[PDB]
Ligand binder design. Structure first.
Ligand code: PC
Ligand code: PC
Ligand code: PC
Ligand code: PC
Ligand code: PC
Ligand code: CA
Ligand code: CA
Ligand code: CA
Ligand code: CA
Ligand code: CA
Ligand code: CA
Ligand code: CA
Ligand code: CA
Ligand code: CA
Ligand code: CA
Lengths: 206, 206, 206, 206, 206
C-alpha cells in the first residue's frame, strides 16, 4: 500500500499511453457506490476528457465520469448516461463526489460541496465487481483502446470510493477534510500501477 | 405516524404518476394561511412545474404555487392568479413562504427570507377546508387529472402550513430554522401517502 | 398619537383613492427641512409614482419626491425640479433622505446612506407651513385630484421630517435607525387619517 | 488661517464665476511636489472638468489635474500632459494623490489609495512658485479666463500639497486619515479667498 | 551587494536602452529552477513585453517569461515555448512564480498565488550557468540586441530565483511574504548593474 496523501498524479502531456490503473480487491458486485476525487485541468474549454473510468469485460463504461465540451459532467453507469450541465466553467481545481444507488437509481452529483439535483439512472442494475479502474484515460475495452482526444491532462488526486451512498453530512466531512474511511478504494492506502508519462507531485489544491 | 425531519421527497423522473398526498386535520375554512416549503429542481429553465397544489372538491386551484417559465412564481388562490417576477434564476435549493389574508387580500411572498412586495388577491374569499393537498403534480380535478408536463422533478421538503399569517420575524425563524409549530400541516407530524416513483431521502439543503 | 414603530402602510392596489394624510403641527414656514422614509415597490420598472407629496394652497407640488420611469428620483420644491438619475434599479426596500436649505438652495439626496451629489434648487424660496401631506398619492389640488397612474403600490414607512438640515452624521444614524427625534413629523408620534384601501402591517425591512 | 477639517467646498451649479482661490505661502520653486484631494461629482458622465489648477504668469497650466471625458484623468505639468485612462467610472467620492519629481520626471497617480503605474513627465523641469491656485475652474490666465464647460460641479476638499514626493507608505496614511503635516498647502490651516457662489458644508465622504 | 528590499526598479519610458543586469553567482548548470517576481505595467493591453530574460551564449531565450498581447504569458526554456493564456487582464500589480524540472519537464506557473495547470516542457534539458539575466528588455544576443517593442515599461522587483522547484507550500509563503532564502538570485542581496533611464523607487505593491 502507498500513502498518496497530499500527493497528486500529474498527466502533463496529451497522450494515449499515460495512465494509472487502480486496484480493487472487491469481492461482491456494487448495488451502490460513491466516488470522490479532485481534478484540475484547462481542457474544459478545448475538449472533453475522462475523469474516472471504471470498466468490466462486458461493459467498457461501467462507471464513467466524463466532462463533455460545452455541456458539463456526463455521468454514466452501465453504459447509460445523464448530464449535469455547467454553463460557466472556471479554471480552478474542482472536487466532485458522485454516488449511485441501485435500489432507487438515484444519482447524486456534488461539485465543490454543493449538490446538483438528484436524477434517475439504471434502477435495478448491478455494477460488476471484476473491474479495471483507469485514471488519465477513457478505456474502450477491459484495459485499453484509449483515445488520445479523451485523455485527461492536468492533475487528479484524493480518489476515494465507497460501496454505499454517503449521506450529505458525510460528503461535507469529505470536502472540508474531516477524517473518513473509504471501504472500496482509499487514497491513504492506494494500490496502483503507473504506465507511461505520469508523475506523482505535491497537490496544488488546499 | 411519521416525522420527516431532515428528510425530503425525491421525484427523480418526469411522470404523470409519481405524487404524494398530504393530509390535514382542518375543517374550519381558511380565512388566512401561510405555507412554507423548501425545494430544489433544475426545471426552472426548461419548463413550468407545480410546487404546491391545493385543491378542493369545488375548485382544482384553491391554492397553487407554480413556476412559470421565463416569468417566475405564479401564486393563485380561488383560481385567481398573481405573478411574482423572477428576472434571473440560479440553480440552488430555494425556500419560499407565502401567506394570504382574506380580511385584506394581501399576499406576501418570501424567497430565501427576502420579501417580495405585498399584493392584493381575492379579498373576502374563503378557502375550503375539504382539501386534496398534493406534492409533485398539478391537479386539475380533486386529486387527479395530473398533467405530466406540469410535474415537479427533484426534491421537496419542510412543507409547513399555518391557518394564520406569520409575522416577518417568524418567517425569518422558519428560514434560519428556529423552533416553530404549524397547526394545519406539520412536517414533523406529517400524515401522508405516496404513489409511484417517489423516494424519501436525506435533504440536500442545510 | 400613534407609535407606528415596526409598522408600515401597505397600498396593495392601484387606485386614485387609497391614501393617508399626515398632520403636521407646523405654524412657521420652512426655510429648511429634511425628510427621510422607507418605501418598497415594484413599480420602478413600470411607471412613475409619488413617494411623498407635500402641498399648499399656493402650490400642489410644494415638496414632492417622485420616481420617474427610466429617469430616477425627481425631487421638486416650489414646483422646480432636479433629477437624481439612477442608471439601473433593483427590487429591494429603499431608504431615502432629502434635505434642502433656502439660505443656500443646496439639496442633498441620500439613498441607503450613500450621498448623492449636492445640487441647487430654489435658493431663497420659502416652503409654506399650512400643508396637506399625502402618502400613497400625488396631489394636484390642495388635498386631492389624485392621478391613479402616479399612485404608489407597495409599502411606505419610517416617514420622519425635520425643519432643519441634518448633518451627514445624523443622516447616517437615521439610516442605521439609531436614536433621533423629529420635530415636524415623527413616526413614533404620528397623527394621520387613512382613506380607502390602506393597511398597517409589520415592516418588510430591517 | 481656517481649519477646514470635516468641511468641504460645494459648487452647486455650473458657472464660470464660482471658484475658490487658495494661497500658498511658498516662495521657492518646486523641484518636486505631491497634491492629494477628495472630490465628488456626477459630471464624469457628461463633460470634462478642472479638479485642481495651478498657474503662473508664464504658464496657465503649470499643474492641472483634469478629468477628460471618455478618457480618464489628465495630469499635466508645465503644459505637457499624460493620461491615466479610466475605462469604468462610478458615482462616489474619489480620493486622488498625484506626485511628481523633476529629478526623474516620474509621476505617481494614486486613485482611492490604489496606485497607477509610474509615468515620466517633464524630466528636469522646474515649477514656478509665483503661482495662483484655483479650485472649481480651469485657468487660462494667471487668475482668470475661466471656462464654464470646464468648471467643477459638486464638492472638493482635503486639498493638501507637499513640496516633495510622499512615499507609498505615507500616501496610505493620507487615504486612511492618519497623521500628516503638509508644508505647501494644509487643509488644517488653510488660507483661501472664496469668490462667487461657493459654500462650505460638512463633507460627504467619510 | 545591495539589499533592495521594499524597493523596485522603475522603467518609466519605452526604450531599447534602459535595462538592468542581475549577476547570478551561478556556476553549475541548472537541472531545475524557480523564479518569482513582482511587476506592474499597463502595456498588457497594448503590446507584449519581456518580464524576465535569461540567456546563454548558445541561446538568447534560455529562460524567458514573456507576455503575449491577447494571449497571456509565454514561458520558454531552451527556446521552446508554452502559453498560459489569460482571457481577462486587470491593471494591478501581479506576482508570478514559475518552476521547471529537467527530470520531468513539468512547468508550474503561479499567478498571485493561484496555480496554473502543470505543463510539460523540455524534458531532460539543462540550463547553462554562464548566463546573462536582464530585466526591462528582451535580449536577442547574449547581452544585447534589445527590441524597443519588447521592452518593459513600469515596475519590476522582488526578483528571486532558486535552483530547485519550490513546493506549493513554499510558494505560498513567498506570496504571503513569509521568510525564505533564494540561492541563485536574491532580492535581499542583489548584485546588479543599471544602464540608461532606470530608477530605484519605493515599491507600489503591498
Ligand atoms: C461519455 N461519452 C459517451 C461522451 C464518451 C465515452 O463514450 P465512448 O467513447 O467510451 O464510447
Ligand atoms: C398556474 N398556471 C395557470 C400557469 C398553470 C395551472 O393552471 P391549470 O393547468 O391547473 O388549469
Ligand atoms: C412627474 N413630475 C413629478 C415630474 C411632475 C408631476 O406634475 P403633476 O402630474 O403632479 O402635475
Ligand atoms: C485638454 N486639457 C483639459 C487637458 C487642458 C485644457 O487646457 P485649456 O486649453 O482648456 O486651457
Ligand atoms: C515573443 N517570443 C517570446 C515568443 C519570442 C521572442 O523571440 P525574440 O524577439 O526574443 O527573438
Ligand atoms: Ca469507453
Ligand atoms: Ca472512448
Ligand atoms: Ca389545476
Ligand atoms: Ca393542470
Ligand atoms: Ca402636482
Ligand atoms: Ca399630478
Ligand atoms: Ca489652461
Ligand atoms: Ca481652458
Ligand atoms: Ca531573444
Ligand atoms: Ca527579441
Amino acid at each position: 500500500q502507498t500513502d498518496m496523501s497530499r500527493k497528486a498524479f500529474v498527466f502533463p502531456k496529451e497522450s494515449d499511453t499515460s495512465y494509472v490503473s487502480l486496484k480493487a480487491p472487491l469481492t461482491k458486485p456494487l448495488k451502490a457506490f460513491t466516488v470522490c476525487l479532485h481534478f484540475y485541468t484547462e481542457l474544459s474549454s478545448t475538449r472533453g476528457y475522462s475523469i474516472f473510468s471504471y470498466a468490466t469485460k462486458r461493459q467498457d463504461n461501467e462507471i464513467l465520469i466524463f466532462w463533455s465540451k460545452d455541456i458539463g459532467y456526463s455521468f454514466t453507469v452501465g453504459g447509460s448516461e445523464i448530464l449535469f450541465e455547467v454553463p460557466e466553467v472556471t479554471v480552478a481545481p474542482v472536487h466532485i463526489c458522485t454516488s449511485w444507488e441501485s435500489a432507487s437509481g438515484i444519482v447524486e452529483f456534488w461539485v465543490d460541496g454543493k449538490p446538483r439535483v438528484r436524477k434517475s439512472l439504471k434502477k435495478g442494475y448491478t455494477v460488476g465487481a471484476e473491474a479495471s479502474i483507469i485514471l488519465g484515460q477513457e478505456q474502450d475495452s477491459f484495459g485499453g483502446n484509449f483515445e488520445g482526444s479523451q485523455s485527461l491532462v492536468g492533475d487528479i488526486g484524493n480518489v476515494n470510493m465507497w460501496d454505499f451512498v454517503l449521506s450529505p453530512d458525510e460528503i461535507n466531512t469529505i470536502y472540508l477534510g474531516g477524517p473518513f474511511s473509504p471501504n472500496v478504494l482509499n487514497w491513504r492506502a492506494l494500490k496502483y500501477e503507473v504506465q507511461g508519462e505520469v508523475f506523482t507531485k505535491p497537490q496544488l489544491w488546499p
